[PDB]
Amino acid sequence: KEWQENKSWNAHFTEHKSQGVVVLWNENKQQGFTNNLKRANQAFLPASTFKIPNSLIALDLGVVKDEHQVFKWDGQTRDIATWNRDHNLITAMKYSVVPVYQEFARQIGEARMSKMLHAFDYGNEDISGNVDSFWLDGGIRISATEQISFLRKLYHNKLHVSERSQRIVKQAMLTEANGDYIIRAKTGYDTKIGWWVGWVELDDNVWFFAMNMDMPTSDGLGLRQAITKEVLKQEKIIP
Amino acid sequence: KEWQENKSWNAHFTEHKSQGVVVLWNENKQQGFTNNLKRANQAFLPASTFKIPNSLIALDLGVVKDEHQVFKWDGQTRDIATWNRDHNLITAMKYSVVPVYQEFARQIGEARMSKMLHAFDYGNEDISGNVDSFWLDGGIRISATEQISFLRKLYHNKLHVSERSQRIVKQAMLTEANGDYIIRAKTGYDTKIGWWVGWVELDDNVWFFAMNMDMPTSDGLGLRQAITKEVLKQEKIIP
Numbered sequence A, B: 001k002e003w004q005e006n007k008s009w010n011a012h013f014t015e016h017k018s019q020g021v022v023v024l025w026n027e028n029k030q031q032g033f034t035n036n037l038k039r040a041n042q043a044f045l046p047a048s049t050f051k052i053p054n055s056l057i058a059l060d061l062g063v064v065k066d067e068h069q070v071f072k073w074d075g076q077t078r079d080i081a082t083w084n085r086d087h088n089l090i091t092a093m094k095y096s097v098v099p100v101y102q103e104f105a106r107q108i109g110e111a112r113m114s115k116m117l118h119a120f121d122y123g124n125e126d127i128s129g130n131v132d133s134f135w136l137d138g139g140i141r142i143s144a145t146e147q148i149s150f151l152r153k154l155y156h157n158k159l160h161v162s163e164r165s166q167r168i169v170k171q172a173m174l175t176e177a178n179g180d181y182i183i184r185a186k187t188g189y190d191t192k193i194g195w196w197v198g199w200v201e202l203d204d205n206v207w208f209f210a211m212n213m214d215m216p217t218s219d220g221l222g223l224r225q226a227i228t229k230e231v232l233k234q235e236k237i238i239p
């Protein structure tokens, strides 16, 4: 009753010839829902979804002074045009500019990064690999339910960082807002798995979500949000 | 070249046999634009846009502890259905719930309300009339350009309240968010005059805006955003 399985959601993966898990948390009702209880606990590389805790650490250690501080383009031309320009934290999260956050990581350092993830209870708290790439190709792993447990602490300012830090990152996670709802979320792609994790704010409740799916090619990345919104629409969380 | 008149925007008021003013401020270029220099500097009752400074003062004085504190419906049935329910700061601003804010004002009190509005350099800084209604039927007045100045201070956290108070109110002002822009803004109506004030966040710039227009009946209230958005589209600030 605290966790329920709804296999009817699998049709949202089936219709797109894909496979994955959607995990929802109803905060008011303290209830979880997923299409696959097993895969909901499978831990994967966080990839770009690691920008949430990475932002928190860089803000709270003073590696990032605020959301307007500019991090200049390094002049290296990269495959994603939006990366080859100056960014602040907000645009850095919106375009998921990895090189910005790799520099963040180097400045944090191994010891403090590892110490902070333990304080966050984040995933398997393993940073083996390059200090500036372990969340792309090192030891760190996190499941969808783990993502939800981390996002809920952030929502309630219960992470061991300043309230200011936590508010700035939730500001930067802002994806969508209209008269019906607000989504604060972050996507990720590790070359094999696609992530979308965040929450949907409503007038009188909040719905946490975390999804991942098999992503053999970059062409289907749009599906991360499509399949999630189909689920939220089936559950009358969004119109 | 600080302020410039663009009378073409009058076509957007003319198109709806209406009259009023749009004022824009290009933050990067420190340059302002309006269709009506005279009306840009004319002072009106702020009405519900006063929820912005009221929220700031309520938070900073501790009348409001955070954005989730609930203010229960007093049971008085009022003409706007969304008012007859419990609200927190986010929903009270979203639904422009005056009784919530009149209670704020009553708890703030005349002496502190006056001192804070003076600290904010807000309008004519005159709170003559009922402490819980002076912004609707009292002696307080503010111009569109004065609105811009106030909002620019809030954006830059330069008001004489805490950084946290300013951040919470900008969160409460969140009106729209998509991949192209964010609008944080507040509407208002005093039964003769309609207001829309706020700003449009872009990747690399912010456009402040304050508009008002003659509002003989409530039926044209959506023109506040419609006419503003026509201007922003014309200036290519939004698609």
Ligand SMILES: *C(=O)N1C[C@H](NOS(=O)(=O)O)CC[C@H]1C(=O)NOCCN
Pocket: A046, A047, A048, A049, A095, A096, A097, A098, A136, A186, A187, A188, A189, A190, A191, A221
């Ligand atoms: C993080 O997951 N990133 C950065 C960027 N984010 O795109 S998103 O999936 O829309 O958030 C692109 C994908 C990924 C990478 O850094 N890419 O390197 C390996 C994954 N393709």
Ligand SMILES: *C(=O)N1C[C@H](NOS(=O)(=O)O)CC[C@H]1C(=O)NOCCN
Pocket: B046, B047, B048, B049, B095, B096, B097, B098, B136, B186, B187, B188, B189, B190, B191, B221
């Ligand atoms: C403030 O301007 N208000 C409160 C409420 N907000 O609607 S909005 O204009 O869409 O922000 C209704 C309109 C207005 C009134 O209070 N209306 O009566 C005027 C005297 N209170």
Ligand SMILES: [Cl-]
Pocket: A047, A048, A050, A051, A097, A098, A101
């Ligand atoms: Cl990253």
Ligand SMILES: [Cl-]
Pocket: A170, A171, A174, B170, B171, B174
């Ligand atoms: Cl926000």
Ligand SMILES: [Cl-]
Pocket: B047, B048, B050, B051, B096, B097, B098, B101
């Ligand atoms: Cl009000």
